[PDB]
Amino acid sequence: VLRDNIQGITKPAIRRLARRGGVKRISGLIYEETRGVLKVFLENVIRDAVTYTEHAKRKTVTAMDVVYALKRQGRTLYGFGG
Amino acid sequence: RDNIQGITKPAIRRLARRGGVKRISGLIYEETRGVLKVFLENVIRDAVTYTEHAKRKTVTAMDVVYALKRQGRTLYGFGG
Amino acid sequence: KPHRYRPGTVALREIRRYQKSTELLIRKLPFQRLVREIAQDFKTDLRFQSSAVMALQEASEAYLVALFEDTNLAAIHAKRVTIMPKDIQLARRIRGER
Amino acid sequence: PHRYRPGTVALREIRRYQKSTELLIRKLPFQRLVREIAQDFKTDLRFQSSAVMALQEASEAYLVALFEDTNLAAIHAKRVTIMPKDIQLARRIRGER
Amino acid sequence: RRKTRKESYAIYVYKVLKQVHPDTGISSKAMSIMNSFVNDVFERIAGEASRLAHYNKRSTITSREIQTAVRLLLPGELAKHAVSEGTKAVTKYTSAK
Amino acid sequence: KTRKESYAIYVYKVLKQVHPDTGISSKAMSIMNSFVNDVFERIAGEASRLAHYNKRSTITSREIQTAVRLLLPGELAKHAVSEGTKAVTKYTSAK
Amino acid sequence: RAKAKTRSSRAGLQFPVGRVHRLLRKGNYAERVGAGAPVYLAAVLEYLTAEILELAGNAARDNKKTRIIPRHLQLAVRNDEELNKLLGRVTIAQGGVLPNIQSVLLPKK
Amino acid sequence: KAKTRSSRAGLQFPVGRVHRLLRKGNYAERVGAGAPVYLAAVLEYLTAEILELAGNAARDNKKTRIIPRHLQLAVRNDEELNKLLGRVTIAQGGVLPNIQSVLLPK
DNA sequence: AGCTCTAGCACCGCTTAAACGCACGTACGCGCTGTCCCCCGCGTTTTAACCGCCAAGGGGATTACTCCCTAGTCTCCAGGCACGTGTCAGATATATACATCGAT
DNA sequence: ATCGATGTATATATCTGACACGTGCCTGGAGACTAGGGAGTAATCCCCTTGGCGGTTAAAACGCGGGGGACAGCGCGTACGTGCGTTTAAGCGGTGCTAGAGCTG
Known part of the structure; x- marks a missing residue:
């Protein structure tokens, strides 16, 4: 189970963005x-x-979906695609 | 015309x-x-x-x- | 002496009165004349259903009110109380309408 | 030793990250973050590479639009520094909060 | 002369109102708002159902299309409640004729 | 199936008809395909709704001309209506 | 022939499954409509209108009227933030708005 | 001899594939003869201006192959396509080099 | 349901740009204040929105009739699409001349 | 005013892997025909909109004091950009390997 990678989006990445x-x-x-904000947006779209x-x-998530x-x-x- | 001013000062105050x-x-x-004129020209268009x-040549409410x-x-x- | 209210409390009572009320705060006749004027720019000699006029008035009033909470939050955000036109421009810019 | 005035390197890297268009968040942390988000709805899910590229592009586009909005709302309050309250203001005006 | 018949969900939402509030009435304008609401929800849910039919190359819409479209457009809590209630209704339908 | 419907060589023909010496990336071609498909679905859905509007079951040129007028803004709508009417008249001349 | 009983009685619902099926046919969303899809659809529509009628009845209880007014519908949509997310782009005729005041807009003593 | 419908309409975009997609899309039970012609014309027109603007942006960047950055610049520079395609983002498109006047140094 | 195979996952070792902590300075956020305007409050003025009512009329609606235009069926074929080839547009190498920032 | 680092525009040389181009082939489009109903047209028709009319009072307009809120100014000190050394891990290519889309029936 993957855990605690919201620290993965690091501070200079947010700086550049x-x-x-x-x-x-x-x-x-x-x-x-x-x-x-990124959690709530990605949670909505991933849901x-x-x-x-x-x-x-x-059982695989498709870029089309x-x-x-x-x-x-x-x-x-x-x-x-569209 | 002048009729855009017909939306009077108390009307914007009430809104x-x-x-x-x-x-x-x-x-x-x-x-x-x-802003009202822009919104109305879009919707009326x-x-x-x-x-x-x-x-x-009459605009109904359904339109x-x-x-x-x-x-x-x-x-x-x-209506729907 | 007659009681004269402090500036800022008859505003409270009018805000409360118009927030508990649902009647249309823009008069029927000037708005329907304005709709007839704007529709002349797209097709001349148009008639209008009355219910179309009330639907347009409903939508216009709701859009302007929602813009007024948006510009009120804009003015509150700038450590201010009075709304400036830059607050309205900010509200329409963030909403993507400009 | 030479040291720049603070305020010009920021504009230089504004120019750098607005002229370029490459991927801007690292791929593997976004991998891991999508894996933790997706494991809540259904465990043991598999992801196409194009799928997480689509999620990443959506994330960059959404956050750059939000950063436009918080920049212009921050300079609405006569500030060159963005506050979090600018972000809640922008998300409230957009209607998603 | 002959009149075109107007199609509305008015009597049925009146029935469910009497089911949930037997003493409470409803005005005709609120009746029209409720009818327009259920018509709009029907349009968007059936549009999403026809979509999800087109998504995975299937030519028909089952109850699974309606359930997936409900889980899409309805937000969380009433989405689970609507899924459970629709599942109960379709199991009642299949247990009966 | 393995037959992927696209517009890649057609958009390439359009680009050659516009800029005969200009190439195009495959990613740009994919974005072009998604754009033309999105515009296709938007106009087709608007036309279908506007057919269901006044209880017409078919789609003629009037539906899709009015959908172009509704969907796209002013100068795009006018020039697209002009081009579509030109193509319609060219078809009716050629039968 | 058997006694005529509607599909809503089979489904235990109040919305007509038959009218939903007929509007799916006449609406022309797909040429093949399943048997249980209008049942599930009438169930979902009945639940949604029942939830909003619960919230409208609660709004009438807080306001003390025995008729449901569009103001009560508008409040019922707005106070439930979940239903507000359902109807975020929807305006109600003569609905009004929630009475709300900003924090710093209140006077300070 | 068999003559294609695109040459009959004077277009590069298809009438056959557009009509087939309209029929299989189940938008309506019947589709008129001129409707796919009109749709192919409109799609041809939109592709014409968007490729013109993309080629102009590539020429401004001294490039001869269209990059998605050029497509993003072409759609974002033109306000006429901006409100048409403000609903949509572009993969690998980037953003306009826009800096507000307050952010500029004194 | 069965079969295919592919791409998704998993792991490893590597390199090095990126992240990281760090110290350090000053620019900017913010409290506080001064001013002054200009918006709010209210009586007065006046006008026009509003209501009730009546005529018109014509326009949307409804009918019945018709036909022609499109779905449907069928055959035919070539145009449109995986594959292979291939070769050059873009990247990176270099030199060369110019505008911009910062300390002086 | 002034100098130097420093990013930027402008010429030529070398390499590659993505795109231009060629070939092939099949499947969808074009061609042909026919039914038959949707769309269109003509004839009523009545209702719903437009317009007029009074009247009249609620409401907009107007003036104006005044105060309080906007806004400019100043001080401040700390929050944060910037730079340097160190360190972490993303990225890379490679290797493996099977779950599962993908397809056919």
């Missing part, structure tokens, strides 16, 4: 906040993708 | 009270009228497009409700 977002200064305690996966009687899982939530994704 | 807004700046009202489909349904703001109370 915020610099792509156009930041100048990072709050020292915003890292946990962004981690929680939807797994529920797609269970309907196909499959992920794409429709994303575009049900209002955010379509390109580059992996 | 801000319903939105729970304390202090309204004096130049909020023109921008609120402009879609509604009269659905209207000009049916070879009718309005599916026009609102199109952008992603579903309205209840008039």
